[PDB]
Design a protein around this ligand. Sequence first.
Ligand SMILES: Nc1cccc2c1CCN(CCCOC1CCOCC1)C2
Length: 150
Amino acid sequence: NQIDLNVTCRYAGVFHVEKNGRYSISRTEAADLCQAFNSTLPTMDQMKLALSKGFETCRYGFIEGNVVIPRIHPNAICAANHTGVYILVTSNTSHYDTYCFNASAPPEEDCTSVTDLPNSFDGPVTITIVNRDGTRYSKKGEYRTHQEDI
Ligand SMILES: Nc1cccc2c1CCN(CCCOC1CCOCC1)C2
């Protein structure tokens, strides 16, 4: 009973989280996930600022209202070579990664590791934060509040 959460650098408080390195988070689970990080789903304005500071990924994730990929550099296999905050328009499916926003984070690029999940609640799951440099932090707990997400 284990979940890996792959997390990125923060840019103006905004970061990306993948569950088990595969698209697998529902919109309701994304909100609970960010809450476990004492974070919220970013607004488009927050995300655009993060992008201006250096934030980009090659993965779809939720923000408040939309599913997006922030892109700085054109890449043919990432958001169809677009730049800016690319908005997913047409999809059959409901499960993606998530973006999260922590207001307490540094204002620009913070590429330090994440070493806590400060607002997870009591639970039976071994939750492991996995940073891009491989550093890991684990704790027993839960963050999902909706039964349909478990
Ligand atoms: N931040 C982080 C920490 C630990 C592992 C990882 C990441 C981000 C990328 N992520 C990629 C996982 C799957 O690669 C995707 C497949 C879909 O297209 C973009 C790359 C791995």
